[PDB]
């Protein structure tokens, strides 16, 4: 018996495993961070801010005693609550395999977008620095896929420059990669191009952002550190309804913004 | 090697571990506060903060996601310097027992200063509240030996009415005791009234602060959590002269204020 | 403990090993000639100059002692300085993973450009020649990619007829193979047309060199002899800042200047 109270939701435990690979199935597909980001934790429900190693002075310099404050990241707490059917919920034990499962789905579209809002242009209440906020590495790209492999090769040599070393993943929004294939009347397949450019990179195509940018993945330069995963709970039962929400604690650290490179196409 | 960086002070060992000595002698007298309340620790450099297990939603109500920030209290990081003299400490390797620590003594007594009004006044800018903050927690009591006994008693009254067992200590301000044995011209020995009043309970004179106090030694109400302890190290070299410090990391809680009562005598 | 004294220095040895790793992993992307010259060493600091297998006679004719000098070439060495902050350390043991290493960054970026001027233009004071210094091995070729493949075609016949083995490595500037990769509006996918043409070969583009050359890589044709490797070691102390430096001894040999064609595109 966790955090969540699953015990006291009165549904059946085929009801309950369905529903996790649900949300899990659709969580795979809607987590665009956790595709090329680094992943950290859990560090269970008591992790409650992460240590950034920086002293604060707020002594003054007459005395003698040099007493301040140690700065660190709070953690973001989410929850949001949904609401399901008892009767639709029980033609699953009758042998219906397909349940009415709209308001979860709806649910977990719309944490997915939040978490991805947060993750790419941050919180300023929270104090997070959104990845787009790191506007000094910017590059200027034109609207041809022969200025996109320019842009391309450009930003491979700042990497070399930098001492970033691959692989390297190309992130660009999916109506541009498709206004791009629009464009190309080519006669080279426009993904194994990419790939040879990037020697061996992947791309990867998503609604949450408008433009292109390249980064690399090492490892150590984007930690997303949990201290509770996405998990679903029980709330209350109203009625012939059961209202269950799903939680989770996290927060984000860009560790180096020189593997990071923007396209302003 | 550690954080101090102790091996490259040109110092003989002999002179670091009476240095050693020495302070830890001096703190065993001038910490008050560690005399009675609960210690935890060490948790290492890295321990920035402390978890409440209080979150703070920062999310309206219209949206349904609930996304909020858990509380917690920063550390506070001391470091307070003085000098030493290379010749003077030169002695101890000739055969000399007696040195000049007046500095390093004076430094001491400083921090112990700073770290007992910390803990007892508390410091509005960590946000930690200190003991006499708790002034719901007060009984009037009397300029007689008489009406401080009959104030224990009410004291322990309350105590068992609150459920808050033994063993009790009296904390009292040195000048209001030594006022209070001049008033004490009885039959009975005061310090024995004391003991037996609190039921085996200890006294502690102490100049921190002004007026006296009861508190319970049950444990767990008042813990001050240490990421490193009290420590010496060796900050730069100059002409004939060595430079020390000495840094901690730490921070207080009140558990249970019930277990505080306060004298206004 | 070392030529370096890095012992002496009052550096935590985590902010050592982290120099060391930024430096390398630097240095893996910076060292251009590394990365195709063959490398011979390390033979120790004392190695002072390499033999030349050549005698000079400075003994006249008439006297029947013949008293000359045996030519050798001097080593080089380089060693350049810069300069850390030490409050800006401490926050690695703290646990800020992010510190400041900007000088550091510049130093070895400009120490990397000196070496790979060294090696490619020479310096006629230490009487190195330089490969561009071999004017005789030219080739004219023109604007295009066709012509670009033409002349690989004819480097490859006129080593074939030297009797030059493979594999072949083509070393082009970046500028213009991003020029060529704008004037490429055709079908055939260059990177794989050049490593068809050169039969398996690999293309290193660079900044240190304006124009393009084909050189090959069977060994004992371009010799780099290192006395001592690159390494970082102490100065001295000074306030709060720490001055470190970067020292290297080493010397650069062609053996045959058949085995590089040089492109006057």
Redesign the interface.
């Known amino acids: 018996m966790e955090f969540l109270k699953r015990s006291f939701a009165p549904l059946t435990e085929k009801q309950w495993q369905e529903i996790d690979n649900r949300a899990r199935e659709i969580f795979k597909t809607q987590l665009y961070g956790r595709k090329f980001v680094d992943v950290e934790g859990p560090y269970g429900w008591?992790?409650?801010?992460h240590?950034?190693?920086?002293?604060e002075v707020?002594s003054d310099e007459n005395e003698?005693?040099?007493?301040?404050?140690?700065?660190?990241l709070?953690?973001?707490?989410?929850?949001?609550?949904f609401t399901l059917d008892l009767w639709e919920l029980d033609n699953l034990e009758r042998g219906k395999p397909n349940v009415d499962l709209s308001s979860l789905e709806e649910?977990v579209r719309?944490?997915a977008e939040?978490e991805d809002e947060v993750i790419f242009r941050g919180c300023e209440?929270?104090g997070v620095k959104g990845l787009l906020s790191f506007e000094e590495r910017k590059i200027e790209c034109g609207s041809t896929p022969?200025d996109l492999?320019?842009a391309i090769?450009?930003a491979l040599?700042i990497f070399?420059?930098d001492?970033i070393?691959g692989p390297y993943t190309l992130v660009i929004n999916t109506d541009r990669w498709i206004n791009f294939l629009k464009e190309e009347a080519?006669?080279?397949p426009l993904e194994?191009?990419v790939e040879?450019c990037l020697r061996g990179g992947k791309i990867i195509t998503t609604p949450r952002i408008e433009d292109a940018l390249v980064v690399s993945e090492r490892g150590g330069d984007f930690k997303l550190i949990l201290g509770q995963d996405l998990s679903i709970g029980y709330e209350d039962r109203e009625k012939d309804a059961v209202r269950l929400f799903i939680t989770e604690?996290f927060t984000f650290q860009v560790?180096?913004p020189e593997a990071l490179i923007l396209l302003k196409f």
Chains 1, 2, 3 share one sequence.
């Open positions: 008591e992790y409650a801010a240590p950034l190693g920086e002293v707020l003698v005693v040099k007493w301040g404050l140690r700065k660190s709070p953690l973001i707490e989410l929850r949001a609550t649910t719309k944490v939040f209440k929270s022969k492999l320019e090769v450009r040599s070399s420059k001492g070393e080519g006669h080279y194994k191009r040879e604690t560790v180096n």
